[model samples]
Target chain A: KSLKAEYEDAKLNQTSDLNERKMLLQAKSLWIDVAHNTDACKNLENEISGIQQKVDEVTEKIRNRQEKIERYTSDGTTIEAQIDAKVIYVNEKDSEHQNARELLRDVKSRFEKEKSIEQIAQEAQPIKEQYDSTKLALVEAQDELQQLKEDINSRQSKIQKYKDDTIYYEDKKKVYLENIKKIEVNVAALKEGIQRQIQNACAFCSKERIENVDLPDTQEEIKRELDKVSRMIQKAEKSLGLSQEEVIALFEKCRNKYKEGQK
Target chain B: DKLRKSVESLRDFQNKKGQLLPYVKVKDHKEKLNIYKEEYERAKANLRAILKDKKPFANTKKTLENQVEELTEKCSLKTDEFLKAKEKINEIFEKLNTIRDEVIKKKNQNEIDDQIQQLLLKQRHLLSKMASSMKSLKNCQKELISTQILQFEAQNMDVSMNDVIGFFNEREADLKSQYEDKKKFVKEMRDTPEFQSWMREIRSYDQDTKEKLNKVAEKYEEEGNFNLSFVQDVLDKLESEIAMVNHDESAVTILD
Candidate 1:
């Protein structure tokens, strides 16, 4: 027979023996109560019922504990499986971490010598501010220099106009002097012609008539016009000073001032 | 002769009844149950402790992720600053070059160029520092992310750990199979013809007859019923009959 049936047979025999003992004890107690009128039957019934209740509690306890054990066993199995899967996940993540570490390390190694971001920013601010202000100053200087250049151009234009006026006055003086020389030459020629006529004793008119005639009188008028033209040439020579060396010196000074403004 | 036959009939009835009872006979079932209870509690406590230890890792994971985020943000800001500084430096260089080209005076132009060169130098220094800072921040972030990912993996270790319980599943299968086999054996013994016949005979006996039968068995206990070997022999015969009568459709039914 199988072990299970063998065990069942043994258990049944033990239970039957116990039941028989109970029945015999109960019958004996009942007989004692009927014959001698004792409380034995009542005592046996209580004792048997107490044993049965205790045994039943034990069975229930065993069953409850067994079910709890089964549940725990399954939980442990599940937990173990979960831990295994987690280990695999950790392994894969480790590889990813290594890759990221290498990449970051490569990037980090490229710039080794430098300050912290905050320090660099702090340092850059003042320099940036100074640069901005300096640039503004430079622009202002440029504008000033431009204005100076325009000033120099305007002053130089005025000086150029002065020089042109001097040239015009000088040219007028030269023409007046040349006309006076020509007039003096005509006067001398007319006097010499009158004397020659007196020496040769050949005259269409007397010397007093030649000297006092309309032609001899025109010579004195020409000599007076020559003196007036000489005075006008002297006045033109005085006005020529505007185009002199001092004006060249003043032009040089304006050029230097414009250059200084550029600086 | 009639009394001897009645005694023999009661013996047969007891022997047949023995086959229908279910039991585990190798050792104490209650003791085994206690051990199972103890082991279950121990394993449960261990798993609970492990899970409790894992709780702190959740906070660690969050902290690591936060650190990574902060570092990434720091790196991004530094990168922007570096790029902006570089742009500014280039702008300065261009402006300086422009100034030189427009300069009419040689000495002043050189002096201005030198000043710009100094500014460019400082600007480049700042850019390099900012770039380095960005690099450091990025590296820190990478390392932090690595740690966070590892923590995440650690948190998932339970699922991956299910792979290699070499004997657990087998032992559990063995246990369930044993339980089923034992259960089937018990069912078979209960349904055996001998057990059913024993139940029918017991039912046929009225209460007065049952009382008389037990009285007779107790009276003869010293003769045979109390002998362990004789009882075992009867039980063994009953087991053999139960094993033979398993699923026998011809067996008479005696159960209500």
Candidate 2:
């Protein structure tokens, strides 16, 4: 109805104000362009000579008018800046309203999350690492052994040929000899090891082995005999060529420490 | 001229507000709150002044009291509307004195229920987070234990020596301290609990504010007697309010 139409008309008036200001700017720039006339250029050339004073006077006049045009544009810029500031405020309010609406829409869209905030077994993890090393270590040991063998052979020739190579050749010869023993032990153990499992009997299960000595079955009890064997070289026995007591001991200490604070 | 135009611009925007549907709710709620806030402020001041004697200059409580007593009571609209308004205001104050305390207490309990439900939901979500953190820490420890086997592995290379060479201690102090730190925090959180305790803390905030109000009420009731000055003062405030009902009623010049 007319009431709503009146509201529309009221809004239309604001646009007219904006359009009116722009038109005013159009008028000022047009006038300045006209005043800076190329049509007046030839009129200055027709003036009499022997008159630097006359030339200076006309030059000063043109200069002053040009300055006047610059000042006019400067003044125009100040007004435009004021209008820009007004528009800036208007957009600021619009953006503020827009952000609030976005917030509201988000609130409507998503509910508050109310947060206002893998693999490998425990025992198996270490076992897997060892197995991995076991594969890698086998190759590593072989390479060093091969390298030592080659290294010592070359040095032995050098020792016979030159006295200068003799000192370290003995030293390297020791490393080579030691390596052969290790390689022999490893190879021989493996050759026998495949059959050893079948040949060996449990120390407790077999009456033929160490008999009727109650070494407890639990991990706790096993640890005691381990330390017992770890002591002096008397009636104590060793389990494996690999002296893993300290490793087992460190592992035990860790488990005990975890258990102490378990609650 | 620009001032006049800007006024028109504001009016235009005001008209445009008609199209902004949600703004109505904000305006409506604002007006409601402002009206209530005004009445509540007036009522609070009256209650405070009634509790004590405030002496000041012109427009003082005593001066206003004298005006109400001395002025002749007459009516333009028979002031019956103003009389009704006064009586309504009186009933409101009386209700505030008597059952209003109950109203406030009920609202307090209701507020407690609402806030507790929201907070507990938040806490439950937090609990799940804590559970996961504990799980992750446990998983990390398992990794360490498994990794310890690698350090033990130097023994495999050291069979002839009867001693492990190049063995690094697998235990990390950082892991121990981190787990213990989380463990300590989780333990501390464990000690605090109960719906009963929640209410205790909730009521603790109320009690702190209540203590302040109580002191004022305490000062007010120091003599407890309806001191003549105070009772008359309350009466004068009420009468002036009531008399003003008649003199310049909105329909005063004429219901004509």
Candidate 3:
């Protein structure tokens, strides 16, 4: 007997393993035939689904367009439709002698309106140009004003900085002046000490002893000696205007130089 | 601390002399090195004296072990001989006792005086021999003690030699390196202008450049708040360099 019919009967009948394998083989052959048909069915469904989606999209576009057309038609219903009918009537009656006067009058009226539009456009140009120039000049003036304000701020800041620096130097000058004053006092004291030594030496010298030295006796010699000592004292004072440590060092130096030349 | 201070003082001397090298070179340190060398040589002698006796001690130690083994063997042999003689004496005593019992049992009078006299002669011979062996063993112990003393002395000398050699070699290498570096640095300092100028300038300031720049700097100080000394030093150095560039034949000035 044919296997497909037997496999159908075997489904209701109790089947052994060999009988089941035979039924499976027959069912598989029929499934292959069904698969071939269903393969085309699947592609057909896809094609149908694609067209359906496009149709829905087009239908929606058409509905939107219909709404737009209806809205435009309603908006133009009375006066727009009348103007269109008149235009068509004018075109139609151009060849007719009875409506030629009406057509000529409409043309004349449109020419006059166009001339008025040209006149208005001509009159607006100078005012618009003037307005544009004024607007541009105002904008430039604002920018210049902003720049001037910035320059003022920056220059003010620089002046403030210079003022602070001047103040700092002023304080430093005060310190330098005080140091100079102290050094001058020291020089005065040293001069006094030397004068005392010269007086003592003068006393010793009158006693005819060379153990001590005296100042020069003659005016000319004394002037030269005083000038030299004054110059040395000036140098020592000048060192104080440089650095405090340098002043102290130069003081020691000049003192040593003086002592070296002593009696 | 004194040695550390000495080294630091020498280091300060090196700095003051414008010498990157050591102030005290190898010749200066020769006496110190000689002292160390003498110490090392003495340590070596001491080590040699100790090591000289080490060999004999090792020999004596081996010999003493051998002698001890021989003495022990001889003692064991003597002990065995003494024990055999004692067992023979005991057997003779037992035989004497049985003879006396036989004389008593048979009712015959027999004198045991001859056997007792012979036993006394055997005991005196064994006792004298044992005493002599013990005295000879004590002599062996004395010889071993003296040998140990020699070995210990040798080891002490060897330890000294090892310690001295290690310390001397290390110290000698360090001093030699220091000496070589010091010589090289002194040579380098002699060749440099910076070193010469440093010495010259330390005695007196550069008067020629200082005078011209000080005038200009003081003038600027009157006019502006610019740094006087800093500017003066710069101008002085530049003037000196310019003067040198003009005076020196080999010197080249890249700028006009």
TM-score leader: 1
Model 3 residue B49 CA deviation in Å: 54
Each candidate structure's TM-score, on Cα atoms with residue i matched to residue i, is: 0.23, 0.11, 0.20
lDDT of 1 by residue, A124-201 (tens): 556555555655655565555446545546645654554555455455545545655564565456546544534443
TM-scores of the candidates, chain A only? 0.30, 0.17, 0.34
RMSD of each: 72.1, 65.4, 68.4
- Name the docking class for model 2: incorrect
- Fraction of native contacts in model 2? 0.00
User: Candidate 3 — which residues are off by over 4 angstroms?
Assistant: A1-117, A206-263, B1-256
Candidate 1 C-alpha error for residue B214, in Å: 14
Query: For model 3, how does the per-residue alpha-carbon lDDT over A217-249 read when each residue is reduced to its tens digit?
Result: 344443333443344344434432456466446
Error of 2 at B54 (Å): 84
Please write out the lDDT profile of model 2 over residues A1-263, one tens digit for every residue. Answer: 54443343344333334344343333333322222322232233222222334445545555555555566556556655755665565566556555544444333222222212112223344644554565465546555544654554664544344343333444554554565556555545554643343233232123232233433334443433333322312211232122446544544454455456454
Per-prediction DockQ: 0.00, 0.00, 0.00
Candidate models: Cα lDDT each: 0.47, 0.41, 0.47
